[PDB]
Structure 1
């Protein structure tokens, strides 16, 4: 017997709740990350969906 499932999803570098996803790369990234991407002309949209912000 053995198990090892990861629950919450946090950036492997920032370790912060991932509330975004980069299309181009097709991977999930955190908020801080976005900055870089959004700067490199990378498409990024919120997972949870639309919010007040």
Structure 2
């Protein structure tokens, strides 16, 4: 799996709103406040 440029954490959450993969710290950040995310099983 790729890691986040902002936070260095695993890119395993798909943000439906932004049509992109984000990390758990992205999900906590103001930038994805209230955004629906889907956990990806690491392949």
Normalising by structure 2, what TM-score? 0.72
RMSD: 1.7
Larger Rg: 1
Structure 2: tracts of 5 or more residues without a match: none
Of 2, 7, 16, the residue aligned with 1:9 is: 2
TM-score, scaled relative to structure 1: 0.62
Instruction: Please state which structure has a larger fraction of its residues in strand.
Output: 2
Question: With CA pairs under 8 Å and 6+ residues apart, which has the higher RCO, 1 or 2?
Answer: 2
